[model samples]
Target: MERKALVTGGSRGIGRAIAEALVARGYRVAIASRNPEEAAQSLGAVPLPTDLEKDDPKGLVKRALEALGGLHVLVHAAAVNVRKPALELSYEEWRRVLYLHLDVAFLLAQAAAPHMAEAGWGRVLFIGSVTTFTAGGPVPIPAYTTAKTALLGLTRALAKEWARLGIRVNLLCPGYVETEFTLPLRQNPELYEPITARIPMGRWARPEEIARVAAVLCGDEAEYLTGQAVAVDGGFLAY
Candidate 1:
């Protein structure tokens, strides 16, 4: 039987590539994004337009389950980045960042847990960041870093809690993938040059590479993996 899955942010970048990867591996997928039309693009994926930041994040998962018939995998690749100094960030800025990244992650996982539990098998991937370990860039983003680290904590907690229930939660941290999400970094020579220099591979990761790893982690061969932060960086963490 084809496994059903939900991918948030599947409209573009890493999420888009991950969606394609899952589809290539023969899984039925539904995508949830603010732009349903773009997300609805190709590979026969059902698109559920959702303002994951404002609407109930659980509903995104619920709708995906309905569209896919039943969902066993969920990839939380949806994110909002606030590019500003942490000290200068307003209360609203912090709240918005955390709400979309951290809060939504919690909600989606909680909503998906029961269905995965009953199925006696499940895969949950949190699209985290290398920032969870080191400060990323001339980009002074405290909230983004904070939320990412918290996401790793959430991954570990949920993995521990749900492992017995046959569900697995893990973190997918990328160093610097060349995606629309990282376009700002790509344009700035100050940030781009130094960032790539740190990577042993000396280049940005293609979204497809990260997507391939995500597909593997979510696959049956990886059934024993959980609560781990898998960095698909070009050896950036090694430095």
Candidate 2:
């Protein structure tokens, strides 16, 4: 029997690649994003439009269950970045980023956990970032880094609580990947050169490379892997 997976923010970039990777591995994949049409076109996976910053993150999980029958895997890949100085960030901007990254992650995980517990198998993968560790010097995106750091705590807490129930929860932290989200920085020589200099590998990660790790985590091979934050950065953490 094919497993079912739900990928949030699956319309583009890392999310889209994760959806494609799951599909390629023979799992039935459903995607929930704010733009359902773009998700349909890009992912070719079942699309559930959702506003993660809103109060109704549970609705996305409900729709995923309706489309995929039940979710055996969940990839929490939805996030927003407000690239402003800490003092300059508006309250609304901080709330939006935190709500999408942390609040939605909790709600969606809560909604999906019961189904997984009943089914006796599930994989919960949170898309985290290197900013959780490298926060002070290079990047000033305070809200983004704070929320991602919270995910580390969230992953461990949930894993300890849900392990006996047969649900494995883990975090996948990707270094700067080549995506539309990162294009502005990539295009700026002033920013790009300094950023690339820190990465010992001297390059950005491809979406598919991160997707492959996601696929493995969601697969049967990772049954025992839980509460771990695996960095897919090309030696970005080393320096």
Candidate 3:
């Protein structure tokens, strides 16, 4: 029994960690990222150099399917944001953010679902953000927040529709994760202090911490779970 997974943004941060975790779980993994060759080489996984905004989602999955021979898990973890307030945000920026975060996710899952259905067991996990619940973070990210929030709708609908087919769809929302994406915030005291104080855990999450939970959701034991937005947010939502 062999399981195959394709992870977008899998070369770095939470995506990379999830790729590593899946490999550890005996999954043959293919990673898609802008510069995935190095990470893929290190992890002994296939590399798919992709431009999330520019690449065709369906095509990307096609390549993954060809490379891996089949697909069982699909993790849409690629992300981007334009931090301007709504009033100042350009329509192009808004669309780009939404396109990458929401549109691409739907397209990728749409393309992957049938194969999963054929296998009668599959997982689709979207990497979401705590800002979806909070609406804004240390900075205003209207586009990012809107896209992430919309994932809930996609997750639930897909989960219900696919449950009978043995396909599970869920969203994993992480809060202030300590990844390269958040390095600048960590370096800036003005940006870091308030956000850290807000989390009951008093610190950001390690990418591996988030990855471990993701591994479970993508595993056999989580068969009964679907259509849920599980927040690995360091009690940020609870506080």
Instruction: Show pairs that collide, candidate 3.
Output: none
Number of clashing pairs per prediction, in order: 0, 0, 0
TM-score of every model versus the real structure: 0.97, 0.96, 0.97
Model 3, CA-based lDDT: 0.91
List, residue by residue over 86-177, the lDDT tens digit for candidate 3: 99999999999999999999999999999999888999999888876878567778999999999999999999999998999999998888
How do these models rank on TM-score, best leading? Answer: 3, 1, 2
Per-candidate RMSD, Å: 1.1, 1.4, 1.0
lDDT of 2 by residue, 81-188 (tens): 898888999999998898899888898899999988988999999999988777835557999999999999999999999999999999999999999998877886
lDDT of 1 by residue, 1-239 (tens): 38988988888899988988998899998888888575566757888888887898877877887788888999988879887887789999999999889999899989998999878899999988999887776778899999999988999999999999888889999879988888988896998988888889988988999998999988996789999999988999898
Position 212, candidate 1: lDDT: 88
For model 1 the TM-score comes to 0.97
Superposition error at 195 for model 1 (Å): 0.8
RMSD of 1: 1.1
Off by over 4 Å in 2: none
